Design a protein around this ligand. Sequence first.
Ligand SMILES: Nc1ncnc2c1ncn2[C@H]1C[C@H](O)[C@@H](COP(=O)(O)C(F)(F)P(=O)(O)OP(=O)(O)O)O1
Ligand SMILES: [Cl-]
Ligand SMILES: [Cl-]
Ligand SMILES: [Cl-]
Ligand SMILES: [Cl-]
Ligand SMILES: [Mg+2]
Ligand SMILES: [Mg+2]
Ligand code: NA
Ligand code: NA
Length: 326
Amino acid sequence: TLNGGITDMLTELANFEKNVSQAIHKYNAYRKAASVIAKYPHKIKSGAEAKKLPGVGTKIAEKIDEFLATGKLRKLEKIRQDDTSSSINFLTRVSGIGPSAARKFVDEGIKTLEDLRKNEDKLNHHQRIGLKYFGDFEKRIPREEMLQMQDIVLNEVKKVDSEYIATVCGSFRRGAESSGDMDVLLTHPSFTSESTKQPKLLHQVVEQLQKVHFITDTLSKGETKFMGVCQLPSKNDEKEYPHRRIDIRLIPKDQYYCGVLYFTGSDIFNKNMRAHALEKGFTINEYTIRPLGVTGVAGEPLPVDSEKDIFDYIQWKYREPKDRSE
DNA sequence: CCGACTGCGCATCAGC
DNA sequence: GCTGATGCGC
DNA sequence: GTCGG
Ligand SMILES: Nc1ncnc2c1ncn2[C@H]1C[C@H](O)[C@@H](COP(=O)(O)C(F)(F)P(=O)(O)OP(=O)(O)O)O1
Ligand SMILES: [Cl-]
Ligand SMILES: [Cl-]
Ligand SMILES: [Cl-]
Ligand SMILES: [Cl-]
Ligand SMILES: [Mg+2]
Ligand SMILES: [Mg+2]
Ligand code: NA
Ligand code: NA
């Protein structure tokens, strides 16, 4: 946090653009700039100096000059005082309420926590659960609890079928001392890019975790992705732990390396890495890396036997999980 | 100058 | 019902 | 909002 002030500013600007202006490219540009500045190993003394960094252009350099001179940004001060942007910004803090629904609710006079609570019937299932756990989903997860949750998830999975492999990814795999949620990558020999010889592979695991009261609510659920809410058991007399967000992704077993690469992140690291891939004539998703023909059509998946293999294809030196926190 | 900007699962909706 | 587009979040 | 060609 050499430049915590500046990165916060840009982050607030990204969120404004996404939530209020609904300008996805500006949102991503701001996030990119924040990221590159976050990792810059010097305390920035000027906008010119920041403008040397890829992703920081003229407009951002200017805002940086203002913030350095004043400790603030007029543009943001104004935004913070605009009732409508304020209302939309808060409303999108509820899981399931996006830029669109937020703006709608405001239109309809629903713009506070109290408003949402008395208008539950105007929420879809996801939003309803987001509202229910609005406070909990605010709280970070200490690594020590992530370890307990890991322990539970891995053992319960083993109980359904010893052939399942569950890997906790996200910031936890990057070594973070705290996490926003729990991301579980799941594989089983019966599900490969070649065939699905067992149905309900994801369901049985979800059901087991529900049976033991680890999973408490469901936000969405398909054949390969589950998104929901979980909770650690507390002891006699002990207050309860906050409810936590959990995501599970069932990935074909032979595409584990692309899968774990994807799910380890960070989200900006993936974006960067995928952009570079393109510039090298490849496209990467959570399943495969393929070449991009002259015509732009992606070709056949290339052989992959390690995360590193994927880095090699794009002429990047390998980066351990802990060094992918962008 | 200007096209392009990482990639995708699930929920919901519109048009047929 | 189906398919495609859009919303949301990973 | 930024950038590559
Ligand atoms: N927009 C994206 N593009 C590509 N990969 C993504 C994207 N968003 C997420 N992933 C990836 C890569 C991610 O690391 C992973 C989990 O997404 P989470 O939404 O749980 C996260 F990003 F917040 P995490 O890194 O885990 O940080 P905490 O959750 O706060 O602790 O899927
Ligand atoms: Cl935009
Ligand atoms: Cl400010
Ligand atoms: Cl793979
Ligand atoms: Cl693919
Ligand atoms: Mg996570
Ligand atoms: Mg997650
Ligand atoms: Na720059
Ligand atoms: Na939200």
